[PDB]
């Protein structure tokens, strides 16, 4: 595990928290997805590349496809150009049409339910650690290293 290629709008249409947010061409759902992908990147350490189909970036690579290109085509270009001996690529998508392509470029599929579960698990584990800090240096720095840059300033403002 090292790089994760995300199908942006496939996550939005699948996650119940982003399904409803249709106002203004999915602006809120698009922003909160990157916000959750930034939490995932800072915690795990894996690189996140979110790909959106053409119709902000807190240290997360957001790629917008071309006029005549789909998200399926962009993640394939990325998976081939990034597949090396050291790193392993994961494609976060639930599109059945995409499922017959992950194996062809050395990638391991991740369902939208699995990515939603991981983000919730990551937040649940931060929820546990922040609760121990507020109830009270060696453990405070360890929780700070797993948090995003913007969240570090907020947790420090709370304490």
Curated annotation (Swiss-Prot):
CDD domains: PIN_YacP-like. Pfam families: NYN_YacP. This is Uncharacterized protein YacP. It comes from Bacillus subtilis (strain 168). The lineage of its organism: Bacteria, Bacillati, Bacillota, Bacilli, Bacillales. The gene is yacP.
